[PDB]
Scaffold this motif. Structure first.
Motif, short mmCIF file in Angstrom:
data_model
loop_
_atom_site.label_atom_id
_atom_site.label_comp_id
_atom_site.label_asym_id
_atom_site.label_seq_id
_atom_site.Cartn_x
_atom_site.Cartn_y
_atom_site.Cartn_z
N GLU A 123 0.83 -1.21 0.00
CA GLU A 123 0.00 0.00 0.00
C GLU A 123 0.86 1.26 0.00
N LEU A 307 4.79 12.32 2.18
CA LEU A 307 4.14 11.02 2.00
C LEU A 307 3.26 10.78 3.23
N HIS A 309 1.79 8.72 5.24
CA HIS A 309 1.73 7.39 5.83
C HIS A 309 2.64 7.39 7.05
N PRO B 17 7.41 9.31 9.58
CA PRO B 17 5.95 9.40 9.43
C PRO B 17 5.51 10.75 8.87
N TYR B 18 4.61 10.69 7.88
CA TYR B 18 3.94 11.89 7.35
C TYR B 18 4.94 13.00 7.01
N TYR B 150 -10.28 8.94 12.76
CA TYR B 150 -9.05 8.45 12.14
C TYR B 150 -8.93 6.96 12.42
N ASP B 153 -3.89 4.26 7.88
CA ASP B 153 -3.37 4.84 6.64
C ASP B 153 -3.46 3.93 5.41
N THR B 154 -3.88 2.67 5.55
CA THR B 154 -4.15 1.86 4.37
C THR B 154 -5.39 2.41 3.67
N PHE B 155 -5.62 1.97 2.42
CA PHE B 155 -6.56 2.71 1.58
C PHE B 155 -8.02 2.57 2.03
N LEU B 156 -8.42 1.41 2.56
CA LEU B 156 -9.77 1.32 3.09
C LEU B 156 -9.89 2.12 4.38
N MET B 158 -8.28 4.74 5.13
CA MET B 158 -8.31 6.16 4.80
C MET B 158 -9.71 6.63 4.43
N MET B 167 -6.11 14.04 7.68
CA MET B 167 -4.82 13.99 6.99
C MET B 167 -4.90 13.31 5.63
N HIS B 168 -5.96 12.57 5.33
CA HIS B 168 -6.08 11.90 4.04
C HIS B 168 -7.00 12.64 3.08
N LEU B 170 -6.53 14.76 0.67
CA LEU B 170 -6.13 14.93 -0.72
C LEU B 170 -6.31 13.67 -1.55
N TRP B 171 -6.69 12.55 -0.93
CA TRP B 171 -6.84 11.27 -1.61
C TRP B 171 -8.28 10.94 -1.95
N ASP B 173 -10.39 11.52 -4.03
CA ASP B 173 -10.71 11.18 -5.41
C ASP B 173 -10.46 9.71 -5.76
N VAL B 174 -9.64 9.00 -4.98
CA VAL B 174 -9.32 7.61 -5.27
C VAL B 174 -9.78 6.65 -4.18
#
Ligand code: 7B9
Ligand code: 7B9
Lengths: 428, 428
Positions: A123, A307, A309, B17-18, B150, B153-156, B158, B167-168, B170-171, B173-174
Motif C-alpha cells: 500500500e 508522504l 503514511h 511518518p507523514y 481516524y 493509513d491503508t486505503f480502506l 483512509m 490527513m487523508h 487529498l486522496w 478522489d481515489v
C-alpha cells in the motif's frame, strides 16, 4: 499456562486462522510447542514430535528458528530500548538497517520507508507511485497494471492487484479498485508476450501510475517461475511509456531465488521495491518500501509535500535490530554457494516425482522446489503422510512445494523431498 | 554508529511518518535508550533523560523495559520465535485470545490477529462485508462514520478518515466513498442522534457497518464525546440491521478510565479492533474481534471462510509479550491508578485555562489536552519541552499527553508543567 488439549479447546472456540472458518474446518490445527533450527516440535496424538519446517514458516525462517546470533541481537536491543516513536526521533537500529538495505538492493534505491507487514508495504508503494504522479501534475495516472498469477497481500488495495481467481474477486464484485491485468506471464521467454504487454500498457499509459509484479517467482498465487528477461522488458516498457515499475520482493528477497534479490537475475532496478518476510529472519513482522531519489524528491516537491503514511510501530527497534543481524548473517557467509547446493539437492530429490501419474510438472528455482499435480491435494491425506516422515508441509491448490531454511543439511533436504514425492504419489 | 553518524544515515535514507525527504524543518532527535517512563535522547551531543509523555503514541502503558514484559519476551524467545498459523496453533495465541474474549465487551467471542492497527481495521471491514454477503445482501457494502475520526493509513482505512480536516483529505478522489455524519458533539444532544438515525435510515440498504472510535477521537483531534451517543448508535444499528464496529486501537486497555471505552456506555459492538497498548508497546500487533453470529454467518456463507491471513499472523513473540502486558494490567488496581493519573493531569493543566492562546483544557482518564487557538509550531514546542525534561509531540493546535500508567505523581506534574509552558510560548 495451557496444556495442548486446553490450547485446542480455546483455539477451536475463539481463534480465526488464515483463510479459514470458525467451527467448520475439516482439519483442526496442530499444536506447535517449540521451534529450533530447521525443526518444529508439534503435538501429534498427544506426543511431541520434531518435524522439518519445509516451508520456512512461509519463506521467513531463512536461518532457521532460534538462531543464536539473532536471539542475541534481539536480547541485546531489548536491554537498551524496546521501542520509541519514529515521529521526531530516530535510532541506531533503523539507521543500521536502512544503510544495509540501500547498499544491497538493486542500484538506485536510496530511501527506505519501514512498515509492519508486507501488505502495508505494498500500500505504501502504491501511495508513493500515485503521489509521484500527483507531484508531476498528472493525477489521472492512478491505476495499477500487473500480470495474472500474482499475489501482493490482502488489504483492499493489495487485493486489487491479486490474481482474480487466486484472490476470489468474484466474492468482491463492486468493492475492489479495477486494475489492468495482462495475461499470465509464461515460463519460457517469448518476445511476443512482452510486445502484447507493451501494446496493452500503451493503451492505458495515461491512466497508469505503475506496473507492479513479483520478479522471477510468483509465490502465493501459484509458485510459478518466469524468465528474468521479462523483467528487462518491463523496465524498458515502463521507461518508454512513463509508468513507474514496482517490484514486490517480499517473497523473493534475501537470496531465495539464487540471487540476493530476484531483480538481479535480470540486472534491472525498479523505481519502487517492497521487502518483508525473510527480512527479520522470521522473528517478527517487519517490512520496508524503497524508492529512488527521483521518486522521493518528486513526492516531496509536490503540493502535498509529504508522504502521508506513518504506522504507530514504524521502524520498531526490536524488529530492526534482529533484521540487521539476519541480513549481516546472510552477507557474512557464502550464501550463493549455499543456495546452489540447496537447489541441486531439491532437483535431485524431486526428480523421481517427474514420472508419477498425477504430476504435471516439477520445477526448482534456488531454494524453492515445486511439484505440480493435476488435481487438488487433499490436506487430510497429505498432512499425516508428511508428518509420518518428519516433515511439516502445507500444500495448496494442486501444488506440493517447499522453501526450506538455508541451514538445512543434505540429509534434511533428502528428507523434505522424500516427503514431497510421497505426497504426490498419494495424489494419484 | 555514533549519534552524528545516525543523523547522517537518517537524513540520507530514512522516511519518517507523514514527512518529506530532504525538506523537514526539524531534524529528528537521536534516541539511544528507554527505561520506565524515560527516554535517553542526544541533545547537542549530550544524553538527556526526558519523560515519554506520549507513551510512544499510546503504546507504552507499563513504560519501557518493564521486567515482567522483558521476561515474557525472552522466555518465549527461548522456546519458539514464530511459526506459521496455517494448520498450526500455539500457546501464546490461545492465552491471548482467551484473555481478550474475557475482558472485551460481552459477546465478542472470536479473535483475528494481524500485524497493525490499520490492517485490523481492514479486517473489520472485510468481516462486515463478508457477513452481509453471507446473508445474500452484497449491496450492503458501504461504511458510515461521523466526522473527526481516524482509523489508519491503508486505503480502506483512509476512506473513513475525516474527509476535510483529516490527513487523508487529498486522496478522496481515489478512495471508497463512505457516508459521513457531522462531528459528534462533546455534550449529549438528542437532536444529533435523531439526525444520525435519519441519515443512516436513507442509506441502510447500502450500509454494512457504522465504524467509530468510542468516547475519544484520537489522531483526528483529541475530542471527547458523551458515552450516551454510543448507546444511541447501538440502538440505531440494531433497529436498522447495520453492524456496529468500534475502533479501540487508541482507547483500549484502560486509557480512558474504563478497561475499554465502550464500557463507559455498557455497549457491545458487533466487531472491535484493538492494538497499540495491546503489546505494552514492545512489538507491533493488533486484533479484530467479532461475535459468534458474525463468525458463523461468514463461515456458513458461499465463501466458507474469512478471506484474510497475513504472513506473520498471530506471531508467538508478539502474542507472548501482549499476554504479559494484559496480565500485568489486570493484576493491579488499574482503575484507581488511572483515576489518580486523571486527577494529576486535571490539577496540573488547570493554570493553562488562563493563558491567552488556550481555548480549552480537557482530561479523560490518562489523556490530557490543551487546545490552543493556532497550530502549534514544532520548532518552538519541541525544544521548549525538552528544556523541561519532557518529550512532547503536539499536532495541529493541540498540546497533549497520554503518559505511561507507571508515572509517579511528581512525573505527571513535570509533564503538565512542560505542557503549560509550551502553551505559554504558543501565545508569545
Ligand atoms: C509477494 C508478496 N507480497 C505481499 C505479501 C503480503 O505480506 P503480508 O502477508 O506480510 O501482509 C505476501 C505475503 N504472502 C503470504 C500471505 N499469507 C500467507 C498465509 C502466506 C503467504 O505467502 C507476498 O508473498
Ligand atoms: C484509532 C486508531 N485506529 C487505527 C490506527 C492505525 O494503527 P497503525 O498505525 O498501527 O496502523 C491508529 C493509529 N494511530 C496512529 C498512527 N500513526 C501515528 C504516527 C500515531 C498514531 O497515533 C488509531 O489511533
Amino acid at each position: 499456562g495451557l496444556t495442548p488439549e486446553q490450547i485446542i479447546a480455546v483455539d477451536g472456540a475463539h481463534l480465526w486462522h488464515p483463510y479459514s472458518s470458525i467451527g467448520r474446518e475439516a482439519v483442526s490445527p496442530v499444536v506447535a510447542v517449540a521451534a529450533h533450527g530447521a525443526w518444529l516440535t508439534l503435538i501429534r496424538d498427544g506426543q511431541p514430535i520434531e518435524v522439518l519446517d519445509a516451508m520456512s514458516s512461509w519463506w521467513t525462517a531463512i536461518h532457521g528458528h532460534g538462531h543464536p546470533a539473532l536471539d542475541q541481537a534481539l536480547t541485546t536491543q531489548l536491554r537498551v530500548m524496546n521501542h520509541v516513536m519514529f515521529g521526531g526521533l530516530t535510532h541506531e537500529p533503523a539507521a543500521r538497517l536502512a544503510k544495509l538495505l540501500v547498499d544491497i538492493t538493486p542500484a538506485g534505491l536510496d530511501t527506505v520507508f519501514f512498515s509492519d507487514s508486507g501488505s502495508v508495504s505494498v500500500e505504501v508503494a502504491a501511495k508513493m507511485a500515485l503521489q509521484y504522479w500527483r507531484g508531476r501534475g498528472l493525477p489521472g495516472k492512478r491505476r495499477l497494471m500487473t500480470w495474472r498469477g500474482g499475489y501482493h497481500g490482502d488489504t483492499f488495495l493489495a487485493m486489487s492487484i491479486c490474481d482474480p481467481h487466486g484472490g476470489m474477486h468474484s466474492l468482491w464484485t463492486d468493492v475492489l479498485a479495477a486494475q489492468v491485468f495482462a495475461p499470465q506471464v509464461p515460463r519460457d521467454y517469448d518476445p511476443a508476450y512482452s510486445a502484447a504487454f507493451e501494446a496493452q500498457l500503451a493503451q492505458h499509459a495515461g491512466e497508469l501510475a505503475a506496473v507492479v509484479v513479483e520478479p522471477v517467482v510468483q509465490g502465493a498465487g501459484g509458485m510459478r517461475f518466469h524468465d528474468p528477461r521479462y523483467l528487462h522488458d518491463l523496465r524498458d516498457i515502463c521507461r518508454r511509456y512513463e509508468v513507474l515499475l514496482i517490484f514486490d520482493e517480499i517473497a523473493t528477497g534475501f537470496g531465495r531465488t539464487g540471487a540476493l534479490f530476484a531483480a538481479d537475475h535480470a540486472g534491472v532496478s525498479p523505481d519502487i521495491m517492497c521487502v518483508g518476510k525473510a527480512l527479520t529472519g522470521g522473528y517478527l513482522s517487519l517490512a520496508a518500501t524503497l524508492c529512488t531519489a527521483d521518486v522521493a524528491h518528486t513526492i516531496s516537491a509536490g503540493a502535498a509535500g509529504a508522504l502521508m503514511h506513518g504506522p504507530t510501530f514504524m521502524a520498531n527497534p526490536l524488529a530492526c535490530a534482529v533484521s540487521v543481524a539476519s541480513v549481516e548473517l546472510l552477507l557474512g557467509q557464502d550464501w550463493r554457494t549455499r543456495i546452489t547446493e540447496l537447489a541441486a539437492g531439491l532437483t535431485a530429490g524431486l526428480d523421481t516425482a517427474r514420472a508419477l501419474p498425477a504430476v504435471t510438472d516439477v520445477r526448482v528455482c534456488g531454494a524453492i522446489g515445486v511439484i505440480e499435480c493435476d488435481r487438488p491435494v487433499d490436506l487430510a491425506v497429505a498432512t499425516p503422510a508428511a508428518l509420518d516422515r518428519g516433515v511439516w508441509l502445507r500444500p495448496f491448490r494442486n501444488l506440493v512445494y517447499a522453501m526450506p531454511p538455508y541451514i538445512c543439511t543434505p540429509a534434511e533436504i533428502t528428507q523434505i523431498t522424500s516427503a514431497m514425492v510421497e505426497v504426490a504419489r498419494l495424489v494419484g
